[PDB]
Amino acid sequence: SLSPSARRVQGALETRGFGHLKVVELPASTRTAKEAAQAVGAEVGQIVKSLVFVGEKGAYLFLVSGKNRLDLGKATRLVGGPLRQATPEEVRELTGFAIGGVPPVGHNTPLPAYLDEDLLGYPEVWAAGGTPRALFRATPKELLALTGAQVADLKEG
Numbered sequence: 368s369l370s371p372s373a374r375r376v377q378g379a380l381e382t383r384g385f386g387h388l389k390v391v392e393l394p395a396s397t398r399t400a401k402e403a404a405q406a407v408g409a410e411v412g413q414i415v416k417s418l419v420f421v422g423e424k425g426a427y428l429f430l431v432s433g434k435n436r437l438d439l440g441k442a443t444r445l446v447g448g449p450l451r452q453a454t455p456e457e458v459r460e461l462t463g464f465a466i467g468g469v470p471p472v473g474h475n476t477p478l479p480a481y482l483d484e485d486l487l488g489y490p491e492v493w494a495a496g497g498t499p500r501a502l503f504r505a506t507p508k509e510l511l512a513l514t515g516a517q518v519a520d521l522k523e524g
């Protein structure tokens with residue numbers, strides 16, 4: 368059913384012990400946080416954007432709520448060294464997925480991660496499932512368990 372990249376994310380959820388979480392590849396786009404929320408009837412804040420930044424020693428994953436903008440200054444202080452937004456080419460090289468479908472798991476390398484503390488305000492959130500049509504629902508606590516992320520104030524607001 369699922370396209371390869373979506374199947375890759377579903378396989379990662381299964382491998383990590385969260386096989387009860389299901390990737391869906393929908394009849395409406397989920398490319399942007401706005402479209403993803405409309406596709407599943409969620410508030411945009413419940414959508415998880417998985418953003419990749421490149422640092423001096425490696426890359427980092429920032430899981431940001433769809434209602435927030437990642438503050439590069441805050442991210443830089445958290446990592447403790449310079450950071451720059453990954454180009455679409457670097458996103459593909461690093462994660463195995465392309466912009467619009469970057470998931471929080473299943474990458475070529477598990478990236479140290481940070482979770483936007485506002486995601487903890489929702490009982491369930493939806494993260495990308497590997498493609499611009501794929502999402503999976505999970506509780507914020509399950510997302511933390513899946514990524515090992517550290518909770519942080521990431522937003523510009």
Ligand SMILES: Nc1ncnc2c1ncn2[C@@H]1O[C@H](COS(=O)(=O)NC(=O)[C@@H](N)CS)[C@@H](O)[C@H]1O
Binds near residue numbers: 398399453
């Ligand atoms: N040209 C680009 N170069 C680098 N980053 C980009 C580019 N275009 C978009 N992005 C980044 O990728 C983000 C879009 O991916 S996202 O926020 O994680 N959202 C999604 O993947 C949706 N599927 C909802 S789950 C944009 O908000 C932006 O931070």
